Symmetry: C2
């Protein structure tokens, strides 16, 4: 088994992904801007660890990665999940919102990836999963900048897979479609072949597979969107 860092695990899909690595046998570390009732999990559910952190900061991520390595002695993988949304046509789009969007959604992820990748190269095995989006594959009006940042990570996946392959590390993307998280709903159900929203547990399941049993699979971008995109 081993240890997995899941970025942005304090709520929503990240949290469901944390709660699924833990049941599966892995130690999990995670981080967010603010603490939620990860407080419960802090007591220990496969020994889990959580920290305040700002993902745009390199030396903070360095400390965090280091701590996670002291606490559990090892790293086996990374799930890049942390992303902030950006609705709005590019013409209404405030120039400063583009900058935050590149920093939160692309730069942090690349910083973390550089950090964890370093630890993965020591061990000589590991897997990375970048959680992306169907917007990175299809294109939706008003998600312009968000689509750029997601498709960027999907570009990183193919290239980084060629790079870390020879050192026994796999890298893949998971592109979730519409799932429930806390009445055009109808347009969605009708365009989805499976005719309903997905469940976080179904996305997390996909991720789990690609970390824990995806031995000859790398460079892939799999959509878990009830067929929405196909």
């Amino acid at each position: 088994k081993g240890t997995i860092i899941v970025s942005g695990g304090s709520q929503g899909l990240g949290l469901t992904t944390v709660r699924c690595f833990l049941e599966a046998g892995y130690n999990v570390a995670t981080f967010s801007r603010r603490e939620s009732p990860a407080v419960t999990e802090l007591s220990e559910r496969a020994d889990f660890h959580w920290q305040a952190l700002d993902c745009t900061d390199y030396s903070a991520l360095t400390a965090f990665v280091q701590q996670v390595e002291k606490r559990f002695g090892g790293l086996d993988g990374l799930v890049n999940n942390a992303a902030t949304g950006v609705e709005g046509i590019l013409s209404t789009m405030r120039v400063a919102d583009i900058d935050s969007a590149l920093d939160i959604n692309l730069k942090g992820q690349l910083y973390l990836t550089k950090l964890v990748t370093a630890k993965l190269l020591k061990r000589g095995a590991g897997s990375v999963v970048n959680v992306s989006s169907i917007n990175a594959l299809r294109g939706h009006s008003g998600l312009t900048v968000y689509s750029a940042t997601k498709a960027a990570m999907d570009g990183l996946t193919r290239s980084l897979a060629k790079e870390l392959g020879p050192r026994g590390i796999r890298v893949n993307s998971v592109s979730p479609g519409y799932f429930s998280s806390d009445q055009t709903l109808s347009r969605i159900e009708r365009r989805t072949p499976l005719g309903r929203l997905g469940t976080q547990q179904e996305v997390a399941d996909l991720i789990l597979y690609l970390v824990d049993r995806g031995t000859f699979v790398t460079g892939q971008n799999i959509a878990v969107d009830g067929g929405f995109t196909c």
Copy 2:
């Protein structure tokens, strides 16, 4: 008639693309960080404008797009061109930053400005020049591939957004082409077995701006069948 802005077009593919648009009957406005000759073209082949400019400074792109819009009446298309080996574990945090700024935010800035001008006119054509690295995967081209593939996610998206206003948006992904070792592993790996020319890439670009009227949202490789 018909004005195109082309990014970084003072040398290489940019510059080839520029001449190809002048020769085709378009007004072409371009920029770069530094001059180089081909200030020859200051006189104007088909009416030309060029200017030194830091593509990451939003004021500077604004002045450029305002001024050019005044010099030509309005804007019909944009060619996003402007453009780094190294493995992630060696890359310095600083090169991560400037690459993201130069190759990506610059491009978004310019896209935002020009797109507003294009909405005014009700028609037009954007072309993001990507790279076969945004499609396939090459080691040591991680951050470059990310920024290239970013501008393909944008294409698909902006196609959906600007489409109902008559602007079409497309990526061209060039493979290996002559640009001013004994790799022929690339000739063996290319069905046509020969590097491409800048003229060939620029030609597809011209087709997408000048006439592909029901083609949008695409990403086309000009790579000799390499991918």
